[PDB]
Amino acid sequence: ATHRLLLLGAGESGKSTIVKQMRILHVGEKATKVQDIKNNLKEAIETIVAAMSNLVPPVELANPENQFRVDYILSVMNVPDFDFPPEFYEHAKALWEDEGVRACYERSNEYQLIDCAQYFLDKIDVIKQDDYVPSDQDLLRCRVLTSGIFETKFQVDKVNFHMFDVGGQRDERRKWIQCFNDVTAIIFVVASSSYNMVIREDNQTNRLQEALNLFKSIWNNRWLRTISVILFLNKQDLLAEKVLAGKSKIEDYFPEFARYTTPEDATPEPGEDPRVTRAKYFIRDEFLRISTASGDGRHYCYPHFTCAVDTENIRRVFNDCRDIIQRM
Amino acid sequence: MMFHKIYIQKHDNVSILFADIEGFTSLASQCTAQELVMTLNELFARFDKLAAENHCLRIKILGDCYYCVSGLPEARADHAHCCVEMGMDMIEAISLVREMTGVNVNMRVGIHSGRVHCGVLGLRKWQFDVWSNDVTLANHMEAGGKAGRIHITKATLSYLNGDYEVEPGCGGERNAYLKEHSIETFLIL
Amino acid sequence: YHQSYDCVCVMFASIPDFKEFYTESDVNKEGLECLRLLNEIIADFDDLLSKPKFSGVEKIKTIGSTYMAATGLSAERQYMHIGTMVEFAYALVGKLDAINKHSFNDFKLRVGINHGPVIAGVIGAQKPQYDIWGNTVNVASRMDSTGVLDKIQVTEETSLILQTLGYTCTCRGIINVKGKGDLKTYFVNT
Ligand SMILES: Nc1nc2c(ncn2[C@@H]2O[C@H](COP(=O)(O)OP(=O)(O)OP(O)(O)=S)[C@@H](O)[C@H]2O)c(=O)[nH]1
Ligand SMILES: C=C[C@@]1(C)CC(=O)[C@]2(O)[C@@]3(C)[C@@H](O)CCC(C)(C)[C@@H]3[C@H](O)[C@H](OC(C)=O)[C@@]2(C)O1
Ligand SMILES: [Cl-]
Ligand SMILES: [Cl-]
Ligand SMILES: [Mg+2]
Ligand SMILES: [Mg+2]
Ligand SMILES: [Mg+2]
């Protein structure tokens, strides 16, 4: 038996991260990813710094000295093959400890910043070492853009799985079609936490809305009429964090939230704040409303609360997926 | 059925030949629509005869473009030879019609070998056809060929087992596609 | 056998971006998945021929990802078919837009239309494939090959007949068309 799984979703939703877990779970080497981790680091610090003056209102530095460090980062920003001298890390580290820069970090939904920003900036002293060895979590956080289609083959209890990873940005979606025919099932990934952000493509369209519209076009697609969709409501850790933080209200982006009350059949985790329960289930339902409205019997939608960088959770949810695929 | 049924199948180790008349739009402007068709029916009927003999399978006729494939429907290791032979008979056929009709008809022949997908597309007016980069390339060989000669690729040369005397084709200098794709071409003697 | 014609409207509708969409990889079965999408597109265009308002439209063939058709082969009530061809062009655009919505693509059509004398029949010696020939057919093709995305380019003669039917045209200017020379062409207004 051979199952062909197609990963779909908007850009930065977590599709590539899911594939990375499959290798970790079911499959000179990882030294090539060091450079990629270092790029994410340079990308994160330069984006926060360059964003300070453009915000409205503009965020100011807490330390005058750091202005020179700001000048340093912006001057090396466009450098092609950067050598990463030890000065760079000292500058990056200094800037990341400046409270002004952190205030600008808290407002990152107002601009375009990668997800692994805080994770790496907090590990500068680790990444800078010559004898640095990327941990498993480091490889899971590393962000590199997907262009083209990529097949990852693996086995779970002698059962074969062919997983296809695709680019999720607008211009990349035109290739998806090349994987529609003879697909066992689709796994749709959504950045549940990106409700207060806009997509890169135009800098205006809300990320969640884009995911919602993308789901509607997949669910109601003419060529996937009988194809089921396993829905990964990803980035649950970041959702919970934002919800509890109380600074960016969900109902200021999706007004309908103000009417929403947690369902009866809801199954929260142990000790989970009812506020987080409410938010995660609301997002879930916005997707179910679309799947509920059509198909009927031809195909079904199976949602799951996930966190792609958490290997435990992925083992758990993918095993749930195996039960869904085999039963029917 | 999500997608309509596709009547297409892949075939490796095949040779594609393209023949095209020079200045067809120019030629059609001068002579009658009636006589053009007679000169073309005379030419293509003969081509279709030569094709069955040389074991080539004619695909379509696009006004002045004539193309066939050797190695279909069943595999044949004699393929590259067939297409080369087919072009030989073609060029000679055009010469007889040039004199018999007194019309200025000239063609360029292009040959390439590789894999092709063949079959039909659509629901109505089915016509057997071939598609692939190799077919695309074969088409450009005709465009980058020379009047009254057979322009072949390195790939086609490797299937010919050295049975034909060739000379440097320099296809890269007459067609942008052949150059940008670093294709080595040869003209058959 | 063959029959001569006096007023047939020929149309070439290309999809110039398809060639770039086409690729060969182990993931796409060496271009088979791309040919599958082209099959859906061509099929969607074929289903239009079943519309009553298009009973006069005769599909001649497909050249790659290009669609070729004609009207008046079943023969200004005498020039009506020319307007039917243009309507058929707009319909193809509607079908191609539908395809774009579902395949997350942005294919645009480039149409060329002309009319005049043609010769209908079958040539060759292997299979009975109906086709049309003539200078008229050549110019229609040039109208496509020298056209613009999302536009219907027509010859001067065609723009005139189209004007008496209610269509309005914009002069593209005088362009040197290979084999013909300086031809004044037009774009049908939407
Ligand atoms: N905190 C957190 N980060 C996550 C989670 N899932 C993915 N990420 C991070 O988000 C980033 C983007 O994920 P990625 O998998 O690269 O996106 P993608 O869907 O493949 O993106 P693309 O190729 O369409 S442009 C990565 O840095 C990844 O580590 C999650 O559940 N929690
Ligand atoms: C369908 C895609 C693709 C790439 C496949 C292919 O091999 C072709 O169909 C050939 C070469 C091929 O089918 C042989 C006939 C002809 C008419 C020469 C084609 C066109 O040049 C196509 O391009 C156009 C412009 O339609 C092209 C190149 O398109
Ligand atoms: Cl998303
Ligand atoms: Cl684990
Ligand atoms: Mg990716
Ligand atoms: Mg020619
Ligand atoms: Mg030609």
According to CATH, what is the number of the domain A1-30+146-327? 3.40.50.300
> Which residue range is the domain that position C26 belongs to?
1-190
User: How is residue A307 written in tokens?
Assistant: 């966190």
Q: Three-state DSSP class for A39?
A: helix
Cβ of C101 under 8 Å from any chain A Cβ?
yes
B152: left (phi over 0), alpha (psi -120 to 50) or beta: beta
| Contact status, residue A149 vs residue A7, Cβ threshold 8 Å | no
- CA pair distance A276, A254, nearest whole angstrom: 16
**In which element (H, E) is residue A97 found?**
helix A86-97
Q: Which residues contact B129 (CB under 8 A, 6 or more apart)?
A: B59, B60, B118, B119, B120, B121
| Contact status, residue C42 vs residue A187, Cβ threshold 8 Å | no
Q: How many CB atoms lie within 10 A of CB A94?
A: 17
Number of domain units in chain C = 1
> Which residue has 């087992």 as its token pair?
B161
Residues of B with Cβ-Cβ distance to A176 under 8 angstroms: none
Pocket probe mutation, ligand 2, options B17, B117, B121, B131, max atoms within 8 Å of Cβ: B131
**In which element (H, E) is residue A213 found?**
helix A207-219
User: How is residue B99 written in tokens?
Assistant: 């004199």
What is the three-state SS of chain C? CCEEEEEEEEEEEECCCHHHHCCCCCCCCCCHHHHHHHHHHHHHHHHHHHCHHHCCEEEEEEECCEEEEEECCCCCCCCHHHHHHHHHHHHHHHHHHHHHHHCCCCCCCEEEEEEEEEEEECCCCCCCCCEEECHHHHHHHHHHHCCCCCCEEEEHHHHHHHHCCCCCEEEEEEEEECCCEEEEEEEECC
Q: Three-state DSSP class for B17?
A: strand
- Which residues of C are annotated as catalytic? 142, 178
| Contact status, residue B79 vs residue B113, Cβ threshold 8 Å | yes
**In which element (H, E) is residue B110 found?**
strand B107-119
| Contact status, residue B139 vs residue B66, Cβ threshold 8 Å | no
Interface partners of C (3+ CB pairs, < 8 Å)? A, B
Q: Is the CB of B8 under 6 A from ligand 2?
A: no
User: How is residue A168 written in tokens?
Assistant: 């999720």
> Which residue range is the domain that position B110 belongs to?
1-189
Bridge partners, C154 (sequence order): C113, C186
Residues of A with Cβ-Cβ distance to B3 under 8 angstroms: 180-181, 223
> Which residue has 């580290």 as its token pair?
A93
| Contact status, residue A197 vs residue A109, Cβ threshold 8 Å | yes
User: How is residue A200 written in tokens?
Assistant: 């890169």
Q: Three-state DSSP class for A207?
A: helix
Q: How was this structure determined?
A: X-ray
N residues, chain B:
189
Architecture of domain A31-145: Orthogonal Bundle (1.10)
Tell me the residues of A at the C interface, defined by beta carbons under 8 Å apart: 148-151, 164, 173-174, 176-179, 181, 217, 221-223
User: How is residue A61 written in tokens?
Assistant: 């530095």
User: How is residue A275 written in tokens?
Assistant: 């506020």
- CA pair distance B10, C10, nearest whole angstrom: 33
Contact at CB, B26 and C59, closer than 8 angstroms: no
Catalytic residue among B16, B59, B64, B183: B64
Catalytic residue among A12, A98, A115, A138: A12
N residues, chain C:
190
Vertex A34: Cα angle to A31 and A36 (nearest 5): 125
Q: Which residues contact A249 (CB under 8 A, 6 or more apart)?
A: none
Cα distances (angstroms) measured from residue A181 to each of B70, B132, C13: 31, 20, 27
Vertex A21: Cα angle to A220 and A156 (nearest 5): 85
Where, residue-wise, is CATH 1.10.400.10 in chain A? 31-145
Strands B107-119 and B65-70: unpaired
Catalytic residue among A21, A47, A115, A143: A143
Number of domain units in chain B = 1
- CA pair distance A248, A195, nearest whole angstrom: 9
Confirm or deny that C141 is annotated as ligand binding: yes
Residues annotated in a binding site of A for Mg(2+): 16, 146
| Contact status, residue C5 vs residue C65, Cβ threshold 8 Å | no
